[PDB]
């Protein structure tokens, strides 16, 4: 195929159960870490689903892939409505950028909820975002891509692991550690997307990091999918060495607009 | 003494099917497998989200449906989802209860609510055969939300 633009699909879609904002109040009367077991075998609208129940406040493992996000709650609609998200997501990005550079690639994927639990009218305002960072004015393009097969032992190996990101060094996977990320043939990713040939915005994180650590000509990544759409692509990072970090990542509410979402509980 | 012979096990052997044909139902926005049941997100009306739960009742030994309605209201530039508690008159408007009956009560831990389709006579309704029990059930019961859904 021909050098093509590399399009990215939004990283996730939130589904916060009402049983969440109750558990909140129960606890608010006596910032917290939210946890969720990622379902990768079935997306919705072709993207990962971040599900937030009431028990989204405790780890059940040391078997299944748990994502750790963070929720900060505000006191008034003022402190909430008046707090520029861009800076928030930005800062959240830089933390993650750092964590990837010095530890493992998995440590870059995370989510953030800013919520205003108004007990007065028993309404709830929240907004979730899953950081996607890239060096300003950076662009990507696929040189070529091949169809990955999961019936491959190599894939079966990534599947068995309990991580979303990993490496291939000789045909055997391995923690995407800054060091291992310098002689690694390619990176593997349990994509949070099912759109044909369109990986999740969260891929940029893998790129931005993998690059700033082990600069290369091209970067081969293998997007693994429960679907039949798995594929391996040769990516090219153009124009990006800029020091400043640009981070997008907020989900769009049901109106299509980039605003929070309200879960009204007036009846109860 | 007739009564359902449907075992929770037998009920679970049949849930995947209910899930399969329930996918054909074009109103379905989503379908989560949950423990001993299925939880669908449905678009009942163009501003009414139907949170539907299918579980297995241990008292009467039949499959049951508890749900609850949500209205898609828009505050300003923000999308809101609000729980609805309608009168049985209001409720009987947006559904097709007919000979059936639903009672609005509270959830296990009295945190919120659910509409419960009374399940007592469920068995005298579906039939003798434990084979396809969940099919004949959902086929008929589902009609309470859409007369046109063909299973």
Separation of alpha carbons B138 and B151, rounded Å: 8
Separation of alpha carbons B105 and B85, rounded Å: 10
**Of B73, B79, B112, which has the smallest distance from its Cβ to A253's Cβ?**
B79
Helix (H) or strand (E) holding B45: strand B37-45
**DSSP label at B35?**
T
Q: Residues for chain A: how many in total?
A: 268
Mutate to test the interface with B, among A250, A262, A265 (most CBs of B within 10 A): A262
Question: What is the dihedral angle through the alpha carbons of B51, B55, B57, B62, rounded to the nearest 10 degrees?
Answer: 110
Separation of alpha carbons B9 and B7, rounded Å: 5
A77 touching B (Cβ < 8 Å): no
Q: In chain B, positions 31-70, which contact chain A (CB-CB < 8 Å)?
A: none
**Of A15, A18, A253, which has the smallest distance from its Cβ to B78's Cβ?**
A253
In the numeric block, the tokens 């086929």 are attached to B139
Name every residue whose Cβ is closer than 8 Å to that of residue A230 and which is 6 or more positions away in sequence.
A147, A148, A149, A150, A155, A222, A223, A224
- In chain B, the residue whose alpha carbon lies closest to the alpha carbon of A263 is B81
> Between chains, do A257 and B30 touch, taking CB under 8 Å as contact?
no
- In chain B, the residue whose alpha carbon lies closest to the alpha carbon of A44 is B30
Tokens of A241: 């060495």
Report the interhelical angle of A85-102 vs A203-213 (nearest 10°).
Answer: 50
B87 touching A (Cβ < 8 Å): no
Separation of alpha carbons A69 and A95, rounded Å: 13
Separation of alpha carbons A228 and B8, rounded Å: 34
Q: In chain A, positions 33-62, which contact chain B (CB-CB < 8 Å)?
A: 44
Burial pattern A232-264, b for ≥16 Cβ within 10 A else e, equals bbbbbbeebeeeeebbbbbbebebeeebbbbbb
Q: Is B16 helix (H, G, I), strand (E, B) or coil?
A: helix
> Between chains, do A262 and B112 touch, taking CB under 8 Å as contact?
no
B72 touching A (Cβ < 8 Å): yes
Tokens of A180: 């291992």
A109, with CB counted inside 10 A (0-12, 13-18, 19+), is buried
Q: Answer yes or no: are the C-beta atoms of B55 and B63 closer than 8 Å.
A: yes
DSSP track, chain A = ---EE---B-SEEEEE-TTHHHHHHHHHT--EEEEEE---S--BTTBEEEEE-S-TT--------EEEEEEEE-SSHHHHHSS-HHHHHHHHHHHHHHHHHHT-SGGG---EEEEEEETTTTEEEEEEEEEEEEESS-EEEEEEEEE--SSSHHHHHHHHSS-SEEEESSS------TTGGGS-SEEEE--SB-STT--BTTHHHHHHHHHHHS--S-EEEEE--SSS--EEEEEEEES---SSEEEEEEPPPTTSSSS-EE------
How many beta carbons lie within 10 A of that of residue B126, not counting itself? 23
Report the interhelical angle of B133-141 vs B8-24 (nearest 10°).
Answer: 50
> Between chains, do A263 and B82 touch, taking CB under 8 Å as contact?
yes
Q: Give how far B1 is from chain A: nearest CA, Å.
A: 40
Residue A200 CA to its chain's centroid (Å): 8
Please state which of the four CATH numbers 3.30.1370.100, 3.40.50.300, 2.60.40.1730, 3.30.1460.50 is assigned to the domain occupying B1-151.
3.30.1460.50
Tokens of A95: 């933390």
Separation of alpha carbons A232 and A189, rounded Å: 10
Q: Answer yes or no: are the C-beta atoms of B41 and B49 closer than 8 Å.
A: yes
Separation of alpha carbons A222 and A165, rounded Å: 10
- Where in chain A are the domains? 1-268
Q: Is B138 a catalytic residue?
A: no
Q: Answer yes or no: are the C-beta atoms of A100 and A94 closer than 8 Å.
A: no
- In chain B, the residue whose alpha carbon lies closest to the alpha carbon of A257 is B77
- In chain A, the residue whose alpha carbon lies closest to the alpha carbon of B51 is A17
* Strand duo A123-135 + A261-262: pairing: antiparallel
Closest CA relative to residue B64, chosen from B109, B115, B1: B115
**Of B72, B82, B113, which has the smallest distance from its Cβ to A254's Cβ?**
B72
Separation of alpha carbons B125 and A246, rounded Å: 61
């Amino acid at each position: 195929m021909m050098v093509s633009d590399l399009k990215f699909a939004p990283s996730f879609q939130s589904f916060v159960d009402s049983s969440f904002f109750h558990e909140l109040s129960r606890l608010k009367l006596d910032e917290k870490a939210l946890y969720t077991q990622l379902d990768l075998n079935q997306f919705t609208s072709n993207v990962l689903a971040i599900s937030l129940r009431d028990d989204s406040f405790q780890k059940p493992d040391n078997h299944n892939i748990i994502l750790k996000g963070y929720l900060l709650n505000f006191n008034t609609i003022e402190l909430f409505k008046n707090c520029n998200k861009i800076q928030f997501i930005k800062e959240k990005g830089q933390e993650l950028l750092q964590r990837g550079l010095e530890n493992d690639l998995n440590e870059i994927i995370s989510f953030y909820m800013i919520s205003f639990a108004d007990l007065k009218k028993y309404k709830f305002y929240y907004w979730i975002c899953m950081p996607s960072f890239q060096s300003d004015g950076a662009t990507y393009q696929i040189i070529s891509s091949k169809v990955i097969a999961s019936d491959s032992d190599i894939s079966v190996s990534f599947i068995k692991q309990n991580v979303i990101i990993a490496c291939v060094i000789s045909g055997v996977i391995q923690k995407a550690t800054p060091d291992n990320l310098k002689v690694c043939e390619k990176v593997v990713f349990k994509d949070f997307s099912h759109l044909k040939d369109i990986p999740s915005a969260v891929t940029k994180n893998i790129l931005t990091v993998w690059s700033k650590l082990s600069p290369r000509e091209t970067y081969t990544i293998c997007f693994l999918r429960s679907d039949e759409s798995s594929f391996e692509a040769e990516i090219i990072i153009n124009n990006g060495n800029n020091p400043s970090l640009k981070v997008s990542g907020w989900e769009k509410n049901g109106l299509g607009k980039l605003a929070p979402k309200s879960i009204d509980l007036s009846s109860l | 003494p007739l009564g359902s012979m449907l075992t929770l096990p037998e009920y679970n052997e049949q849930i995947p099917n209910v899930r399969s044909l329930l996918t054909k139902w074009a109103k379905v926005e989503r379908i989560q497998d949950v423990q001993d049941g299925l939880q669908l997100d449905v678009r009942l009306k163009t501003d009414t989200l139907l949170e539907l739960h299918i579980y297995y009742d241990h008292v009467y030994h039949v499959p049951s449906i508890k749900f609850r309605l949500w209205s898609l209201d828009t505050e300003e530039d923000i999308s809101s989802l609000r729980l609805l508690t309608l009168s049985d008159s209001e409720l009987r408007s947006i559904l097709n209860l007919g000979t059936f009956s639903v009672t609005l009560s509270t959830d296990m831990e009295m945190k919120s609510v659910y509409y419960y389709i009374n399940n007592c006579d469920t068995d005298a309704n579906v039939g003798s055969d434990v084979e396809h029990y969940l099919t004949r059930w959902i086929s008929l019961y589902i009609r309470i939300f859409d007369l046109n859904f063909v299973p």
